[PDB]
Write a protein that binds this ligand. Structure first.
Ligand SMILES: CC(C)S[C@@H]1O[C@H](CO)[C@H](O)[C@H](O)[C@H]1O
Ligand SMILES: CC(C)S[C@@H]1O[C@H](CO)[C@H](O)[C@H](O)[C@H]1O
Ligand SMILES: CC(C)S[C@@H]1O[C@H](CO)[C@H](O)[C@H](O)[C@H]1O
Ligand SMILES: CC(C)S[C@@H]1O[C@H](CO)[C@H](O)[C@H](O)[C@H]1O
Ligand code: EMC
Ligand code: EMC
Ligand code: EMC
Ligand code: EMC
Lengths: 296, 296, 296, 296
């Protein structure tokens, strides 16, 4: 019935795909409908052209799941010709209709957790700094780390992908920076970091703890199971469809809304390794590896 | 410029999102437009609805990446009415315009890799048999297993997700059926499967070997890196868009088309009952220790 | 005398700086004058404003050293209101006044060299694909690689920086992709590639061969020295000033001018032939290191 | 908005090209425009000729990034005819508006680092002595060098390029003089010095240690990475543009602003006679050892 138009950022990432899917899930309940358009991933203009396409579609309202800086947020919004526009990837400080997850709680649950566990040397692996959310999370980790008087020994950013956690986390360790813990921007890059740690002959949990962010499906699995900050994209899905519907149907709601968020503890977190293999230990292993090579 | 309508499976699953993203990219370079509609895992009617919603938006042509039984594929093509449709998930035998990967080489490369390593006790983990592709790959492991004189000790089916791979493998092992290798319908279920092996105290590769399907993004980065049958969805993307346009210009090929496939061997595969390592493995172990010494 | 305007790509890069300094040498001998205007690396528009800045500069002639995709080349041409326009970073096939190097030869001398030593596993490190020249050279590697029935085991692209060469090469190796040789699209990136290779306890030339493109001032005396495709920028400059003067002097110069390009053999290229040593021998070597490690 | 004229020395050297780039980024932000004019190594007159060219180019203000002794600096300024001018390559004691980095810090930091390591045999590779910065640094090396009772066994002067560092160093070594640490006027030369050192069986860091100046882009990719005094050219570009527009406004500043300098420690430095060690060394051996093993 009520045609919904969604400007979504690359569905290649799991969160968006799970969000769009939720949107479709709820829409079907209200007998509504969703038509999806994928922003070219390049800021306002790309975002704006998508919306323009959506309007030409007979779109009743719009849900804009795409990372928009303030200035660009009001713009795209101003572009939505009297059509109710709800934004899912902005700042809770933007004067537009939005529903977003608590970025304060999320960044808090993570630090507090790692601290309550005894981690001192912690590293940050942020999402691309082009994204609102990423920067908003990097900020949280800084507000609460210093609150607990902690200073990140290393910080760096990927692009939300597994291979990025692997790229960044490999480069770091090489630099001889080995935190006892890592606070990651999302689960995917987290999978990447857990991949780079084992690659480095370290254990996850046991040597270097990793906290994700999102709780995208696959994460209950992952080896070992990823402790992360769950964001219910089923909630963000219904809440936003419903709101967009109200907004559509003159039910003035206007502002920004913040969603719960939570800490799902699993196995990538233990705290923190006191020891490390000594030259003696490495030489030993090397001995038998030598022997084995000899045998060949 | 023009409009390409894609009717796609749940974008919650990674191959669907990667195909659609690839579709978007080729379209991007040719100035076309992509508008995606999503179908409820129900079949024909659910798929028909989506075709309709797209037809109600010009849509120069449709790309239908939704599994359809040969009979329901015809029925669905018949509803596009004068609009060119290209099916990406059907049997290579349905009288429609299709582009599907070689399931015969996929399944053969899987079985031949396992058997040649020496695996006798092999279990199959198939996707929902409500999916043609699932059925195709399943029936294919049978063809090639049978002709290598092998019979699977276990045959199980999930639903494309990582949890299903986990819950199936788990209850398989807990039933006393423990294979030395597993052939899985997709990379996500491969992950859920690895997850369970290790959950039961076994080693992936050394103890239960695992073979995925797709080589979706995150499969490397898995611990250990997933060995798998790679299905270039970047190819599926451009090939799909180009031909779709040819269709909307009378320059159609009209028939079914087969895309290649290849075994990306990584580290979830090993000879059974292996005592003592191999050359490459000694290098891997060595390099880890080296990285471990570097940080010294 | 004659005020010459150079709208140039990033001076931070070496080639552009050498081309601009070369230009200045001629200008000073032919009593000309040069005014450089930098482009902000944003395609046609960014490129146009520069031209606009130059024309408004009483520019008696224009040399556009900026990668301009054919449509945009003609477009910037149109922008050159009544002033001869000589382009330097375009394709061989665009009806405009261009003086460009022969990429067919550059790509061929490179590929033919690496294939002659016995390399089979060759990876590419293209420049940014938004560049015409990056795209021409990349193509040639293909056109010739296939000729000698060889296909890259990797392909990637950087941004013309030594860091992107490092990062991208480091990334290719970090994922187990390790060819016998590399074809790099410029020497700045060649530097990082060498740095990355070494950084991975790998030997340049001996283990991984590298072939850069350009021959900037530093390549001779890089470590080891770099065998690279020679593009004479002292020639480019003189040809541009001379022809720009003539072209404004009334002379009928008109079209494209393909400049030579050769191969500079130095110390970053050797034949492949791997020599394994004995499991006994290597084993012993390891045991050595073991003691060396235990001592520390 | 307004237009900034830049009189730059050869854009063939990296520091200059980097400074200009930084200037452009800043202006861009403040909406200012930039027209570049290149100077010949001739001095006073060539520079004056540059300035007059720009005055004729309208120009709201000029940034003079060219080398001038006190007298030439004052001549050049007087040639600027009222238009605000800022000098970046002068003596911090010249009565003109400038912003030069601190050479006292660079030279002190340099010699202290080599003595802390225990070096006794320190040679000096100064820049062209026509350069106030080149002379200042050489003098600086001499103040803290003699201040530390140490006397340079050798002292030579190149000309800012890699090939001249090589030349002077090959000469030095060739004459029998073979230090154990070297202080070089800039990194390009440092590279050449490092090339010569390898050219002669010697090793950088281990055998002949090397310290450069500038920390220009490519320096962290040199093999081995270069230890060097980092001059922040972004800080130098924005502080200069800001100051020029301000200076333009008639808002006082008048004197000179000494910018900070620091020492980036990398892998071209080591204490003299080293009694065998290095975790990365052994680790590097392991990495190379681990490769023959893989191929075993
Ligand atoms: C509602 C979003 C801000 S969640 C956000 O989306 C990103 C894509 O833009 C990535 O997938 C991040 O991992 C995810 O946390
Ligand atoms: C062309 C398709 C059969 S790819 C197929 O899609 C499925 C969804 O139906 C799953 O995601 C599988 O992993 C994937 O291989
Ligand atoms: C005139 C070009 C083809 S030379 C080209 O310029 C690029 C920047 O534009 C990079 O510097 C490359 O290394 C160089 O080959
Ligand atoms: C602001 C300057 C003193 S930087 C100075 O410029 C020189 C050219 O004049 C060389 O490029 C040196 O490497 C650099 O230190
Ligand atoms: C808490 C979800 Hg293999
Ligand atoms: C197959 C795109 Hg740790
Ligand atoms: C090609 C001769 Hg530091
Ligand atoms: C940052 C030490 Hg190509």
């Amino acid at each position: 019935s009520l045609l919904i138009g969604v400007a979504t950022s690359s569905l290649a990432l799991h969160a968006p795909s799970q969000i769009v899917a939720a949107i479709k899930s709820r829409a079907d309940q209200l007998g509504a409908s969703v038509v999806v358009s994928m922003v070219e991933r390049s800021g306002v203009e790309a975002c704006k052209a998508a919306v323009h396409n959506l309007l030409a579609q007979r779109v009743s309202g719009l849900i804009i799941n795409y990372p928009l800086d303030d200035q660009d947020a009001i713009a795209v919004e101003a572009a939505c010709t009297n059509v109710p526009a709800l934004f899912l990837d902005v700042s809770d400080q933007t004067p537009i209709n939005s529903i977003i997850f608590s970025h304060e709680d999320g960044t808090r649950l993570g630090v507090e957790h790692l601290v309550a566990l005894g981690h001192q040397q912690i590293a940050l692996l942020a999402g691309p700094l082009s994204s609102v959310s990423a920067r908003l999370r990097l900020a949280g980790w800084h507000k609460y780390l210093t609150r607990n008087q902690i200073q990140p020994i290393a910080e760096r950013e990927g692009d939300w992908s597994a291979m990025s956690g692997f790229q960044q986390t490999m480069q770091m360790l090489n630099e001889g920076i080995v935190p006892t813990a890592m606070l990651v921007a999302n689960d995917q890059m987290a999978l990447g970091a857990m991949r780079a740690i084992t690659e480095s002959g370290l254990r996850v949990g046991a040597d270097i703890s990793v906290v994700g962010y999102d709780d995208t499906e696959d994460s209950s699995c992952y080896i070992p199971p990823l402790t992360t900050i769950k964001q219910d994209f089923r909630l963000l899905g219904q809440t936003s469809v419903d709101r967009l519907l109200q907004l559509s149907q003159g039910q003035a709601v206007k502002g920004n809304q913040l969603l719960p968020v939570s800490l799902v503890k699993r196995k990538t977190t233990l705290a923190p390794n006191t020891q490390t293999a000594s030259p003696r230990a490495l030489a030993d292993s090397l001995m038998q590896l030598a022997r084995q090579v000899s045998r060949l």
